[PDB]
A paper describes a structure:
We recently identified the pneumococcal hypothiocyanous acid reductase (Har), a member of the flavoprotein disulfide reductase enzyme family, and showed that it contributes to the HOSCN tolerance of S. pneumoniae in vitro. Bacterial HOSCN reductases belong to the family of flavoprotein disulfide reductases that, true to their names, utilize a flavin cofactor to transfer electrons from NAD(P)H to a catalytic disulfide within the active site. HOSCN reductases, including Har, MerA, and RclA are expected to form a sulfenylthiocyanate intermediate instead of forming a mixed disulfide. Collectively, our results demonstrate that pneumococcal Har is a highly efficient HOSCN reductase, enabling survival against oxidative host immune defenses.
We determined the X-ray crystal structure of Har in complex with the FAD cofactor to 1.50 Å resolution, highlighting the active site architecture characteristic for this class of enzymes. Har is a monomer in the asymmetric unit of the crystal but is an expected dimer physiologically as for the homologous enzymes MerA and RclA and other characterized flavoprotein disulfide reductases. A minor species (∼2% signal) was present at 4.2 S in the 2 μM sample, which may correspond to a small proportion of monomeric species that exist at lower concentrations. This experiment demonstrates that the single chain in the asymmetric unit of the crystal structure is a result of the crystal symmetry and that Har exists as a homodimer in solution. The monomer of Har comprises four domains that are characteristic of group I flavoprotein disulfide reductases (FAD, NAD(P)H, central and interface). The FAD cofactor is bound as in other flavoprotein disulfide reductases, with the isoalloxazine ring positioned adjacent to the catalytic cysteine residues for electron transfer. Interestingly, our structure reveals two alternative conformations for the conserved residues H425 and E430 of the HXXXXE motif in the active site which have not been previously identified. These residues are in the interface domain and are known to play an important role in the enzyme’s reaction cycle by acting as an acid/base relay, promoting the formation of a reactive thiolate that subsequently reacts with the substrate. The C43 and C48 residues were also solved in two conformations (S-S bound and broken), which could be an artifact whereby exposure to intense X-rays breaks the disulfide bond during data collection. An unexpected area of density was present close to the catalytic C43 residue in the active site of the structure, which has been modelled as a malonate dianion (present in the crystallization condition at 1.2 M). A unique feature of the bacterial HOSCN reductases are two positively charged lysine residues in the active site, which are likely underlying their exceptionally high reactivity towards HOSCN.
Numbering used by the authors:
A (entry chain A), B (entry chain A): -3 to 438
């Protein structure tokens, strides 16, 4: 028969980054903790299974002597191991992991299916960590044509598509274009926008466009699609001036908070106008003791932002609440094209818009000895500084290893270190990082 | 006939790092500057032509689909271009570059051969930047046997040696062992010392030994050589218990200040007991206005230390002398085995010896998601901190990209940032650097 409602100190909904971190921390401290996750293919969350880890594992594998099928299998081995490592690490702290989709019956009661019965759970603290789901554009035929995939489906194709279309121009789409180009596909990116990489420094965007085109990718702007349909197994993308034909189509046009399954109408929890779970500076909803962390609260969609939401909630629950969303320091980013394009802080354009007293300096990797050592002259560094306060406003690092190097910048920005320090730092040599000695001699 | 003595504001002896930097800086500012360099194969100095740049260029090339001869030619292309880039950048500032070996006639007069005549030059400031030369052990037969090379000769072998011996166990020897092993040689390292990598953390040295042996290198300790001789073209290294046979032998047992050619007996300039040019905190000799920078002053032998000696001398000549050798901050190092082994600050053993209130933490790369993404689980991170002051005392980063990552640590050590900051920094993901969030949760 059915069980009586189970009471925990904390319930986490979703095996996301903030949630699994908070759950294990409090279970290790002796609290009674439950974590509810709808899919065994998602133990450890989006980054482990469908996001950060498989995407970058596929790109590393594609540079090696492996067939398409071997690259896919390598990705499955790596994500499968981390999936099991995450389940077992969380359960090993004492967290009770439930395999079900949770929905709310009231502010702090959830229901799950548990075999032939429903089971209810409650707690004093509920942390909603349900992530996001792919946007699907309302283009007629997109959702019903064969060989059309989102960013998850594209990771499990049966064979290499000879021609791959990508609809959208963000980090995700461009990383997959780079991947499939390496694997051997003829790749065309179709973007509605006029400007390629409009958030990047223009000089850096121009280099990126050059390198992607050199590598054989076709980058199209101002593309307005009226319909998607099939011709046999192939996909036709019908646009104003041309119909494009592909063996597979990826769409990558954003992801939105995953809130529908929760049945929030059964609670007092408020959504934002855009559909995210609304939170205050402590990631708390308007219901006391109910929080929302990671992508579902509408914040920046990176695993490291979900991790920092754990720091905010843990500060409020276990500490004195002194670290809040209003205190968050600098947030870098990387897009793993070839080479990686990394950035932190303000661009020149952003500093100009704020009327700050700024200066910039740019050095191409082609002028750097380590670029010659590497046999790879792609990329550039660009720094943006405030000539009055001596603060570093931002930097772009587009180069081999930039996903590591960018974090050098963040240490100095977070700690209010003047930009002139980088002219004095003693760097290892030969490296790309030592060129920061020259980039900051402004 | 002969020319009258030429007068400059500054004479630099040797195309080293500090010297070429100072020469171009002051010539660009309108001073009259001469730089005297004995070998056109050395324009740009040791790192460009025989040191940092060819060694690391050979290691990158050896990972690619290139024959031995193609790897050597690639190295020659890269160093040749940087040699010409350095000559032309320095001459383009207005420096007069003389192709000769300089020696002193008195404290601030040098003589060079200039065609069929001698030429004298003088200045108010002389900067001696003559670098170092390879040590050659007094082993009978070492200096007279065929197929025995120092670190320069080993970069120009006629063909791959099937078996390569390396005598000595520093960064230089081990990097060349790694290189020739990749290229296909059977490599044996013969070290007199009992302990492998005695300056590294022991756990890190043990991993390095494991990986080098996995890769096929033989690492021998406590080897005392009594003679080197030839058998035909092969080299025999006669040691107490065994005679080793190789197709070529590298010796790499250190480099010493290159002072003999200068004829310093014709000046008042003092040497240290070990034979370096003695300097004060401003890199100044006991003769006012004569300085010694880089390896020749006995300091740490890295290009980035020679660069920092430029900062010291420039502070004294052009500024207020407020930055001195006594003010130098933290100096990292990398040894480019596979993967690179980087370090900065104190080891655990060094902190223990100083009786500091320290704690340590170590995380293997095998426990880090990016190691799995990379398909490379080699290496580890180790942090050493002061639990009272919260300062970072030191770190070891042995991993892919560690030569970039180590510089993250230096920013925090130089700026007195507490180690707990690294638990809060928002790093890019997936990367090896983000694991600093966990390494510093001590
Ligand atoms: C293709 C791609 C590439 C990316 N690349 C990077 C990158 O390089 N770097 C980076 O930092 N970020 C990257 N991201 C973003 C990053 O993956 C996400 O921002 C982050 O993982 C989201 O974490 P989260 O904590 O919000 O929750 P998630 O990790 O999304 O977890 C939510 C969990 O909730 C579960 N769930 C949902 N609803 C319910 C319910 N009602 N009941 C039970 N379980 C439920 C889901 O099954 C899921 O496991 C990438 C994302 C994608 C898709
Ligand atoms: C194999 C090897 C690998 C190395 N790897 C690295 C590394 O990865 N990273 C690192 O930072 N360091 C490394 N080093 C060390 C680094 O190369 C040296 O520490 C640094 O380059 C020395 O610079 P310097 O300014 O002292 O002068 P140098 O660059 O040594 O220049 C001295 C110049 O003086 C000239 N000269 C000498 N006497 C006279 C004279 N009487 N008249 C005229 N000219 C003269 C020489 O021809 C030479 O060009 C390496 C060294 C070697 C040999």
């Amino acid at each position: 028969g059915p069980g009586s409602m189970l009471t925990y100190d904390l319930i986490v909904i979703g095996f996301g980054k903030a949630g699994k971190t908070l759950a294990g921390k409090l279970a290790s401290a002796g609290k009674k903790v439950a974590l509810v996750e709808r899919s065994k293919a998602m133990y450890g969350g989006t980054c482990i299974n469908i996001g950060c880890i498989p995407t970058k594992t596929l790109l590393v594998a594609a540079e090696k002597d492996l067939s398409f099928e071997e690259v896919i299998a390598t990705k499955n081995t790596i994500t499968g191991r981390l999936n099991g490592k995450n389940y077992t690490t969380v359960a090993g702290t004492g967290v009770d992991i439930f395999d079900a989709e949770a929905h709310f019956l009231s502010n702090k009661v959830i229901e799950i299916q548990a075999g032939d019965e429903k089971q209810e759970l409650t707690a004093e603290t509920i942390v909603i960590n349900t992530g996001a789901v792919s946007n699907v554009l309302p283009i007629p035929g997109l959702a019903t044509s064969k060989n059309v995939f989102d960013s998850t489906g594209i990771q499990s194709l049966d064979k290499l598509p000879e021609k791959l279309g990508v609809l959208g121009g963000g980090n995700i789409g461009l990383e997959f274009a780079g991947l499939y180009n390496k694997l051997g596909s003829k790749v065309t990116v179709l973007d509605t926008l006029d400007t390629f990489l409009p958030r990047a420094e223009p000089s850096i965007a121009a280099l990126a466009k050059q390198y992607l085109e050199e590598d054989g990718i076709e980058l199209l702007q101002n593309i307005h699609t009226t319909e998607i349909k099939n011709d046999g197994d192939q996909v036709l993308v019908v646009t104003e001036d041309e119909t494009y034909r592909f063996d597979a189509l990826l769409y990558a046009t954003g992801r939105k908070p995953n809130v529908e399954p929760l049945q929030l109408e059964n609670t007092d929890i408020e959504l934002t106008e855009r559909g995210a779970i609304k939170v205050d500076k402590h990631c708390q909803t308007n219901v006391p003791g109910v929080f929302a962390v990671g992508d579902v609260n509408g914040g920046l969609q990176f695993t490291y932002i979900s991790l920092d939401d754990f720091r905010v909630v843990y500060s409020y629950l276990a500490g004195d609440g002194s670290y809040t969303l209003e205190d968050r320091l600098n947030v870098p980013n990387t897009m793993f094209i070839t080479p990686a394009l990394s950035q932190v802080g303000l661009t020149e354009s952003q500093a100009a818009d704020l009327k700050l007293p700024y200066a910039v300096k740019e050095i191409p990797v082609a002028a750097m000895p380590r670029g010659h050592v590497n046999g790879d002259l792609r990329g550039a560094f660009k720094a943006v500084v405030n000539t009055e306060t001596k603060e570093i406003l931002g930097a772009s690092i587009f180069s081999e290893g930039s996903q590591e190097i960018i974090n050098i910048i963040t240490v100095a920005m977070d700690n209010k270190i003047p930009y002139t320090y980088f002219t004095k730092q003693i760097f290892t040599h030969p490296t790309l990082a030592e060129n920061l000695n020259d980039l900051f001699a402004i």
